[PDB]
Amino acid sequence: SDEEILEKLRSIVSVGDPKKKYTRFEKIGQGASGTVYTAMDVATGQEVAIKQQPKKELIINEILVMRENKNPNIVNYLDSYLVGDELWVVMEYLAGGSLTDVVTETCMDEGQIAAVCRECLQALEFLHSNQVIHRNIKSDNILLGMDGSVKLTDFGFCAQITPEQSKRSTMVGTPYWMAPEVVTRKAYGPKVDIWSLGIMAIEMIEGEPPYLNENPLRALYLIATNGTPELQNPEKLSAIFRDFLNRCLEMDVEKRGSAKELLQHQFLKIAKPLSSLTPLIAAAKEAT
């Protein structure tokens, strides 16, 4: 019965030698599982990012889900290899870095924040319409292009739902960003991603998710009891922004906005061009 799951992901990986297609191999990061490098396509002259035991079932889920859900607001999966003993997942390279650096080292005005939310909601609307829940939306899993491109990544925790089983009840995600209905093991749908988006907006405002100074469990408890979080300074924000936040962070899932609904919110109408994010990127790179 197992681990014939290991032979399953051997079917997925492509045929050939990795070294023969991508030169200019250079490392640019590492984070628990696993580590990230860089390279160029000898064929097309394209720069690419290469990620490099436990529970490899996730890495399968990540490959498959990424392959069948191409979107301009998703970090594009390319090829896969395994000629060694670690995964050779190749994806498009965004040099601007993660949104985390930006939210914790810079100040974003509402026009910048709206632009980010709109790009993310676009990815969410696409994924949800394909019955996929990301379940781990956070600034850490938002990568930025040097041109201000905003793309979604990390799909190991994705949940493929079906008309027969459109809900889950497993506590997956990262505590500070997890919807109350996920924390309290209740039946939940795609709008949990919308909750995590809201939390990420709080990131973009206050620098970090609510209860971050608390321990993960304490945070988990607080989310389960407090429900919808409070801004430290709600009055700093426009009325239309506060509204968008309220409809992202609604306790009533039915009263909470869908991606498609939220893409029509008046708040996104004050979104700046994506080029406006490049100064935020340069700022984050500095002080680092």
Amino acid at 193: D
36 binds ligand 4T3 (CB under 6 A): yes
The CB-of-198 to ligand 4T3 minimum distance in angstroms stands at 20
Q: What is the C-alpha separation between 144 and 123, in angstroms, rounded? A: 14
List the structure tokens of 4: 């014939």
Residue 247's contacts (CB-CB under 8 Å, 6 or more residues apart) are 255, 256, 257, 261, 262, 265
Amino acid at 40: M
The CB-of-234 to ligand 4T3 minimum distance in angstroms stands at 29
153 binds ligand 4T3 (CB under 6 A): yes
Q: Which of residues 72-101 bind ligand 4T3 (CB under 6 A)?
A: 75, 91-95, 97-98
The CB-of-136 to ligand 4T3 minimum distance in angstroms stands at 10
138 binds ligand 4T3 (CB under 6 A): no
Smaller CB separation from ligand 4T3, 179 or 281: 281
Q: In what order do the strands lie in the sheet with 97-98?
A: 97-98, 142-144, 150-152
Of the candidate spans 23-31, 61-69, 122-130, 268-276, the one that interacts with ligand 4T3 by CB under 6 A turns out to be: 23-31
H helix or E strand, kind and range, residue 259: helix 259-262
31 binds ligand 4T3 (CB under 6 A): yes
CA 146 to chain centre: 18
The CB-of-49 to ligand 4T3 minimum distance in angstroms stands at 4
The CB-of-33 to ligand 4T3 minimum distance in angstroms stands at 11
In this structure, how many other beta carbons lie within 10 angstroms of the beta carbon of residue 70? 10
Smaller CB separation from ligand 4T3, 92 or 119: 92
Q: Please identify which residue in the block is written with the tokens 């079917």.
A: 11
Amino acid at 203: E
Contacts to ligand 4T3 by CB under 6 A: 28-29, 31, 36, 49, 51, 75, 91-95, 97-98, 140, 143, 153
